[PDB]
Amino acid sequence: RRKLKGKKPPEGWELIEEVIEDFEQQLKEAVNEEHEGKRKTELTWKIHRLHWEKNRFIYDLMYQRKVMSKELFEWLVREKVADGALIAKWRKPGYEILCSMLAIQKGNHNFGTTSHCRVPLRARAKQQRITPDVQTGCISCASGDGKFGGPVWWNTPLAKLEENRTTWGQA
RNA sequence: UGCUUCGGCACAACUGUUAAAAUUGGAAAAAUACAGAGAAGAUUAGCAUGGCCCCUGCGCAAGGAUGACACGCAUAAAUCGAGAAAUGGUU
Ligand SMILES: [Mg+2]
Ligand SMILES: [Mg+2]
Ligand SMILES: [Mg+2]
């Protein structure tokens, strides 16, 4: 709603508008899915992956292609279209494909750790090498571990890039 | 992803009461049927006491049949010796 009320969005918003609205429609239907037959912990996995992909479109255009304006990006952050903290993180060295801000909240975890998905899949034991995080669904968002430019999510074949992530592009 | 003597460095570092379960057991209630109320004649107000009895209540109130219970039904032997007499052994 926040973007839709009153005000105008800066120049550029017409390029990203349909994609952003598609991502918002996908999140709208993820919230509405049914949860019978899947773990309690996996409720929000699709929401987290979709939130990642949405902010990764905003990130892709703002910092990897740099086709987004500083004022448009600052608008998206201010109007809550972009997760500003998560995109800010992806800029930090070592947090380049971080799956969620939950994964590196350390009060979030029993032993005061980050989550096991932040740990390079090699340095982990076979027990923590195929299990997705219970909150985010990420198996490995350690930079270096990423398939297709993103994390290794619950179902990421360690197939083809097109079958494993949303591929916006500019047709 | 920076930095790169382009060799590689740097950064980043261990989620999960792990189930979409499986058992697993214990529970209040319902009906049924039982049976179904203090004090001394009857009818009745209560306030207590005691505690491995609780319930309602925010309760250091108040209430729950004086909340209940107990409460004795004491077959709680609370028990026995004094002396004369008299009889039994022994001399
Ligand atoms: Mg009383
Ligand atoms: Mg009372
Ligand atoms: Mg009365």
Ligand SMILES: [Mg+2]
């Ligand atoms: Mg009483």
Ligand SMILES: [Zn+2]
């Ligand atoms: Zn992760």
